[PDB]
Design a protein around this ligand. Structure first.
Ligand SMILES: N=C(N)N1CCC(CNC(=O)[C@@H]2CCCN2C(=O)[C@H](N)Cc2ccccc2)CC1
Ligand SMILES: *[C@@H]1O[C@H](CO)[C@@H](O)[C@H](O)[C@H]1NC(C)=O
Ligand code: NA
Ligand code: NA
Lengths: 11, 250, 28
Protein backbone atom coordinates (compact mmCIF):
# COMPACT_ATOMS: atom_id res chain seq x y z
CA UNK A 1 0.00 0.00 0.00
CA UNK A 2 2.88 2.36 0.81
CA UNK A 3 4.60 4.05 -2.11
CA UNK A 4 8.35 3.45 -1.95
CA UNK A 5 10.34 6.34 -0.49
CA UNK A 6 13.71 7.59 -1.84
CA UNK A 7 16.61 5.28 -1.01
CA UNK A 8 18.63 8.27 0.27
CA UNK A 9 16.59 8.12 3.48
CA UNK A 10 16.62 4.36 3.90
CA UNK A 11 20.43 4.19 3.93
CA UNK B 1 -9.68 7.95 13.64
CA UNK B 2 -13.33 6.81 13.87
CA UNK B 3 -16.17 9.08 12.66
CA UNK B 4 -13.79 11.89 11.69
CA UNK B 5 -13.25 13.70 8.40
CA UNK B 6 -10.48 14.47 5.92
CA UNK B 7 -8.10 17.12 7.20
CA UNK B 8 -7.65 20.32 5.22
CA UNK B 9 -4.27 21.02 3.64
CA UNK B 10 -1.97 22.50 6.30
CA UNK B 11 -4.58 22.05 9.04
CA UNK B 12 -2.15 20.20 11.33
CA UNK B 13 1.37 21.15 10.21
CA UNK B 14 2.86 19.73 13.43
CA UNK B 15 1.57 16.21 12.62
CA UNK B 16 4.36 13.65 12.23
CA UNK B 17 4.22 10.06 10.96
CA UNK B 18 6.43 7.46 12.59
CA UNK B 19 7.51 5.11 9.80
CA UNK B 20 9.20 1.71 9.96
CA UNK B 21 12.04 1.18 7.47
CA UNK B 22 11.79 -2.58 6.91
CA UNK B 23 9.09 -3.36 6.15
CA UNK B 24 8.00 0.15 5.13
CA UNK B 25 4.88 0.84 7.17
CA UNK B 26 3.20 3.36 9.43
CA UNK B 27 3.92 2.77 13.11
CA UNK B 28 2.36 5.69 14.96
CA UNK B 29 1.64 9.38 15.04
CA UNK B 30 3.85 12.06 16.62
CA UNK B 31 4.15 15.84 16.78
CA UNK B 32 6.70 18.53 15.91
CA UNK B 33 7.61 20.81 18.84
CA UNK B 34 10.73 22.48 17.37
CA UNK B 35 12.96 22.16 14.35
CA UNK B 36 14.83 19.29 16.06
CA UNK B 37 12.41 17.65 18.54
CA UNK B 38 9.44 15.33 18.02
CA UNK B 39 7.01 14.18 20.72
CA UNK B 40 5.25 10.79 20.73
CA UNK B 41 3.87 8.04 22.97
CA UNK B 42 6.39 5.75 24.68
CA UNK B 43 4.36 2.67 23.80
CA UNK B 44 4.88 3.50 20.10
CA UNK B 45 8.57 2.69 20.69
CA UNK B 46 8.72 0.34 23.69
CA UNK B 47 6.02 -2.17 24.61
CA UNK B 48 7.50 -5.55 25.67
CA UNK B 49 4.11 -7.34 25.80
CA UNK B 50 3.94 -6.94 21.99
CA UNK B 51 7.69 -7.57 21.51
CA UNK B 52 8.07 -3.91 20.53
CA UNK B 53 11.46 -2.33 21.29
CA UNK B 54 12.55 -0.07 18.45
CA UNK B 55 15.97 1.55 18.09
CA UNK B 56 16.84 4.80 16.31
CA UNK B 57 18.01 3.18 13.09
CA UNK B 58 14.77 1.18 12.81
CA UNK B 59 12.81 4.38 12.30
CA UNK B 60 12.15 7.48 10.24
CA UNK B 61 9.81 10.40 10.83
CA UNK B 62 7.84 11.92 7.96
CA UNK B 63 6.84 15.56 8.40
CA UNK B 64 4.37 17.66 6.43
CA UNK B 65 2.29 14.75 5.16
CA UNK B 66 -1.35 14.55 4.08
CA UNK B 67 -1.79 11.31 2.10
CA UNK B 68 -1.27 8.22 4.25
CA UNK B 69 0.58 6.13 1.65
CA UNK B 70 1.91 8.40 -1.12
CA UNK B 71 5.43 9.80 -1.13
CA UNK B 72 4.50 13.48 -1.21
CA UNK B 73 7.35 14.85 -3.31
CA UNK B 74 8.31 18.52 -2.68
CA UNK B 75 6.00 18.66 0.36
CA UNK B 76 6.91 16.10 3.01
CA UNK B 77 10.33 15.92 4.63
CA UNK B 78 11.80 12.65 5.91
CA UNK B 79 14.16 12.79 8.90
CA UNK B 80 16.39 10.24 10.61
CA UNK B 81 16.54 9.93 14.39
CA UNK B 82 19.55 10.85 16.48
CA UNK B 83 18.24 9.68 19.84
CA UNK B 84 15.11 8.25 21.49
CA UNK B 85 14.28 9.32 25.08
CA UNK B 86 11.60 7.46 27.03
CA UNK B 87 10.24 8.74 30.33
CA UNK B 88 12.13 6.85 33.08
CA UNK B 89 8.87 6.13 34.95
CA UNK B 90 6.88 5.02 31.89
CA UNK B 91 4.75 2.15 33.23
CA UNK B 92 4.38 -0.35 30.40
CA UNK B 93 3.82 -3.17 32.88
CA UNK B 94 0.48 -1.88 34.21
CA UNK B 95 -1.50 1.06 32.79
CA UNK B 96 0.75 3.10 30.41
CA UNK B 97 1.27 5.75 33.10
CA UNK B 98 3.51 8.51 31.70
CA UNK B 99 3.14 7.33 28.07
CA UNK B 100 5.54 9.86 26.59
CA UNK B 101 8.81 9.91 24.63
CA UNK B 102 10.96 12.42 22.77
CA UNK B 103 12.87 11.85 19.52
CA UNK B 104 15.73 14.16 18.55
CA UNK B 105 16.28 14.52 14.81
CA UNK B 106 19.69 14.24 13.17
CA UNK B 107 19.26 17.57 11.35
CA UNK B 108 16.86 20.49 11.85
CA UNK B 109 13.80 20.38 9.62
CA UNK B 110 12.96 23.39 7.46
CA UNK B 111 9.58 24.96 8.17
CA UNK B 112 7.09 25.53 5.35
CA UNK B 113 3.38 25.99 4.69
CA UNK B 114 3.04 22.30 5.62
CA UNK B 115 5.62 22.01 8.47
CA UNK B 116 5.36 24.08 11.66
CA UNK B 117 5.65 23.29 15.40
CA UNK B 118 2.82 23.22 17.92
CA UNK B 119 3.08 24.97 21.30
CA UNK B 120 3.46 23.20 24.64
CA UNK B 121 1.25 24.46 27.46
CA UNK B 122 2.36 26.33 30.53
CA UNK B 123 0.50 25.99 33.82
CA UNK B 124 -1.83 28.90 33.11
CA UNK B 125 -2.95 27.62 29.70
CA UNK B 126 -3.37 24.11 31.13
CA UNK B 127 -5.53 25.34 34.00
CA UNK B 128 -7.65 27.48 31.68
CA UNK B 129 -8.22 24.98 28.86
CA UNK B 130 -8.17 21.47 30.39
CA UNK B 131 -11.76 21.52 31.69
CA UNK B 132 -14.60 19.03 31.19
CA UNK B 133 -16.77 19.92 28.20
CA UNK B 134 -14.08 21.95 26.43
CA UNK B 135 -13.21 20.42 23.06
CA UNK B 136 -9.85 19.50 21.59
CA UNK B 137 -8.79 18.03 18.26
CA UNK B 138 -7.19 14.65 17.48
CA UNK B 139 -5.52 13.77 14.18
CA UNK B 140 -4.05 10.62 12.68
CA UNK B 141 -3.84 8.02 9.94
CA UNK B 142 -5.05 5.14 12.11
CA UNK B 143 -7.92 2.75 11.54
CA UNK B 144 -11.35 4.14 10.62
CA UNK B 145 -13.23 1.55 12.71
CA UNK B 146 -12.67 -1.18 15.25
CA UNK B 147 -10.50 0.11 7.10
CA UNK B 148 -7.68 2.63 6.65
CA UNK B 149 -7.92 6.22 5.34
CA UNK B 150 -6.53 7.74 2.16
CA UNK B 151 -5.54 10.99 3.94
CA UNK B 152 -5.07 12.42 7.43
CA UNK B 153 -8.22 12.29 9.57
CA UNK B 154 -9.41 14.88 12.10
CA UNK B 155 -12.03 14.74 14.87
CA UNK B 156 -13.03 17.23 17.58
CA UNK B 157 -13.84 15.71 21.00
CA UNK B 158 -14.87 17.02 24.45
CA UNK B 159 -12.77 16.47 27.57
CA UNK B 160 -14.66 14.25 30.05
CA UNK B 161 -15.08 14.70 33.82
CA UNK B 162 -12.56 12.58 35.73
CA UNK B 163 -15.14 10.48 37.67
CA UNK B 164 -16.79 9.52 34.37
CA UNK B 165 -13.39 8.52 32.94
CA UNK B 166 -12.66 6.42 36.04
CA UNK B 167 -16.06 4.69 36.02
CA UNK B 168 -15.77 3.77 32.32
CA UNK B 169 -12.87 1.31 32.71
CA UNK B 170 -11.31 -1.23 35.03
CA UNK B 171 -7.81 0.07 34.21
CA UNK B 172 -6.31 2.30 36.91
CA UNK B 173 -6.22 5.91 35.74
CA UNK B 174 -3.70 8.47 37.01
CA UNK B 175 -3.25 12.23 37.18
CA UNK B 176 -0.92 11.88 34.17
CA UNK B 177 -3.92 10.97 31.98
CA UNK B 178 -7.18 12.52 30.85
CA UNK B 179 -9.98 11.16 28.73
CA UNK B 180 -12.14 12.57 25.96
CA UNK B 181 -15.12 11.65 23.83
CA UNK B 182 -18.90 11.96 23.70
CA UNK B 183 -21.24 10.28 26.17
CA UNK B 184 -23.76 7.77 24.79
CA UNK B 185 -26.92 9.15 23.16
CA UNK B 186 -25.35 12.62 23.01
CA UNK B 187 -26.02 12.49 19.26
CA UNK B 188 -22.36 12.62 18.17
CA UNK B 189 -19.44 10.20 18.31
CA UNK B 190 -15.77 9.85 17.36
CA UNK B 191 -12.56 8.41 18.78
CA UNK B 192 -8.94 7.64 18.10
CA UNK B 193 -8.05 4.08 17.15
CA UNK B 194 -5.11 1.77 16.44
CA UNK B 195 -2.42 3.60 14.46
CA UNK B 196 -3.31 7.03 15.93
CA UNK B 197 -1.13 6.48 19.06
CA UNK B 198 1.46 9.15 19.65
CA UNK B 199 -0.50 11.81 17.74
CA UNK B 200 -1.53 15.07 19.36
CA UNK B 201 -4.67 16.20 21.16
CA UNK B 202 -4.58 19.98 20.54
CA UNK B 203 -6.63 22.99 21.68
CA UNK B 204 -6.73 26.50 20.21
CA UNK B 205 -6.28 29.12 22.92
CA UNK B 206 -8.95 31.85 22.75
CA UNK B 207 -6.52 34.23 24.47
CA UNK B 208 -3.71 34.30 21.89
CA UNK B 209 -5.05 32.19 18.95
CA UNK B 210 -2.21 29.65 19.23
CA UNK B 211 -2.58 25.88 19.11
CA UNK B 212 -1.34 24.00 22.20
CA UNK B 213 -0.71 20.26 22.50
CA UNK B 214 -2.53 19.14 25.64
CA UNK B 215 -2.39 15.37 25.18
CA UNK B 216 -0.93 12.39 23.34
CA UNK B 217 -3.09 9.55 21.99
CA UNK B 218 -2.38 6.75 24.47
CA UNK B 219 -4.97 4.02 25.07
CA UNK B 220 -8.57 2.89 24.88
CA UNK B 221 -10.71 -0.24 24.88
CA UNK B 222 -12.00 -0.84 21.38
CA UNK B 223 -12.62 2.29 19.33
CA UNK B 224 -15.72 4.54 19.48
CA UNK B 225 -17.60 2.15 21.78
CA UNK B 226 -20.62 3.46 23.68
CA UNK B 227 -19.71 4.31 27.26
CA UNK B 228 -15.97 4.09 26.59
CA UNK B 229 -13.59 7.02 26.21
CA UNK B 230 -10.16 7.59 24.69
CA UNK B 231 -7.27 8.25 27.08
CA UNK B 232 -4.46 10.72 26.51
CA UNK B 233 -1.13 11.45 28.16
CA UNK B 234 -1.36 14.73 30.15
CA UNK B 235 1.44 16.75 28.51
CA UNK B 236 1.57 19.58 31.03
CA UNK B 237 1.93 17.14 33.93
CA UNK B 238 5.13 15.83 32.30
CA UNK B 239 6.44 19.20 31.06
CA UNK B 240 9.24 19.30 33.62
CA UNK B 241 10.61 16.03 32.21
CA UNK B 242 10.27 17.40 28.66
CA UNK B 243 12.25 20.52 29.58
CA UNK B 244 14.94 18.50 31.36
CA UNK B 245 15.55 16.34 28.28
CA UNK B 246 15.71 19.34 25.95
CA UNK B 247 17.77 21.49 28.33
CA UNK B 248 20.38 18.71 28.62
CA UNK B 249 20.61 17.21 25.12
CA UNK B 250 20.32 20.24 22.80
CA UNK C 1 9.06 28.16 19.13
CA UNK C 2 8.52 31.92 19.37
CA UNK C 3 6.15 31.35 16.44
CA UNK C 4 4.73 28.04 17.71
CA UNK C 5 1.11 27.10 17.15
CA UNK C 6 0.35 29.56 14.33
CA UNK C 7 -0.37 27.82 11.03
CA UNK C 8 0.97 29.32 7.78
CA UNK C 9 -2.21 28.54 5.83
CA UNK C 10 -4.62 29.63 8.58
CA UNK C 11 -3.65 31.93 11.50
CA UNK C 12 -0.75 33.51 9.57
CA UNK C 13 -3.14 34.69 6.83
CA UNK C 14 -6.21 35.16 9.10
CA UNK C 15 -8.12 32.24 7.58
CA UNK C 16 -10.07 29.76 9.70
CA UNK C 17 -10.42 26.05 9.11
CA UNK C 18 -13.82 24.42 8.71
CA UNK C 19 -14.36 23.23 12.31
CA UNK C 20 -12.23 25.33 14.67
CA UNK C 21 -15.35 27.35 15.55
CA UNK C 22 -16.69 24.20 17.24
CA UNK C 23 -13.73 24.35 19.61
CA UNK C 24 -14.14 28.08 20.41
CA UNK C 25 -17.86 27.60 21.13
CA UNK C 26 -17.12 24.89 23.68
CA UNK C 27 -15.03 27.25 25.89
CA UNK C 28 -17.71 28.66 28.28
N1 LIG D 1 -10.04 3.99 21.51
C1 LIG D 1 -8.94 4.63 21.60
N2 LIG D 1 -8.94 5.97 21.79
N3 LIG D 1 -7.71 4.06 21.54
C2 LIG D 1 -6.65 4.87 20.90
C3 LIG D 1 -5.27 4.27 21.14
C4 LIG D 1 -5.25 2.84 20.61
C5 LIG D 1 -3.87 2.21 20.65
N4 LIG D 1 -3.38 1.95 22.00
C6 LIG D 1 -3.33 0.71 22.51
O1 LIG D 1 -3.76 -0.29 21.94
C7 LIG D 1 -2.70 0.59 23.90
C8 LIG D 1 -1.26 0.06 23.82
C9 LIG D 1 -1.17 -1.01 24.91
C10 LIG D 1 -2.54 -1.59 24.98
N5 LIG D 1 -3.41 -0.45 24.65
C11 LIG D 1 -4.73 -0.34 24.89
O2 LIG D 1 -5.36 0.65 24.57
C12 LIG D 1 -5.46 -1.51 25.55
N6 LIG D 1 -6.69 -1.80 24.80
C13 LIG D 1 -5.80 -1.21 27.02
C14 LIG D 1 -4.60 -1.06 27.92
C15 LIG D 1 -3.74 -2.12 28.15
C16 LIG D 1 -2.59 -1.96 28.90
C17 LIG D 1 -2.29 -0.74 29.45
C18 LIG D 1 -3.15 0.32 29.26
C19 LIG D 1 -4.30 0.16 28.51
C20 LIG D 1 -6.29 2.04 21.38
C21 LIG D 1 -7.68 2.64 21.17
C1 LIG E 1 15.09 -2.80 24.73
O1 LIG E 1 16.27 -2.65 23.92
C2 LIG E 1 17.24 -1.73 24.45
C3 LIG E 1 18.35 -1.64 23.43
O2 LIG E 1 18.26 -2.68 22.47
C4 LIG E 1 17.72 -2.22 25.81
O3 LIG E 1 18.65 -1.29 26.36
C5 LIG E 1 16.53 -2.38 26.75
O4 LIG E 1 16.96 -2.91 28.00
C6 LIG E 1 15.49 -3.31 26.12
N1 LIG E 1 14.33 -3.43 26.99
C7 LIG E 1 13.40 -4.38 26.84
C8 LIG E 1 12.28 -4.37 27.83
O5 LIG E 1 13.47 -5.22 25.94
NA1 NA F 1 -13.55 2.09 37.34
NA1 NA G 1 -17.83 6.38 23.66
Amino acid sequence: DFEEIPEEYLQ
Amino acid sequence: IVEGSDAEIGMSPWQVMLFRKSPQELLCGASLISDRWVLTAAHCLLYPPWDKNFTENDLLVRIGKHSRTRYERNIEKISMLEKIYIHPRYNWRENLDRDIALMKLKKPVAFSDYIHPVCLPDRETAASLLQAGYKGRVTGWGNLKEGQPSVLQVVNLPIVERPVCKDSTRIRITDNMFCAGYKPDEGKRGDACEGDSGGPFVMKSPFNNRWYQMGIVSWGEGCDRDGKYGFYTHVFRLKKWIQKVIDQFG
Amino acid sequence: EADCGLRPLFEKKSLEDKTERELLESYI
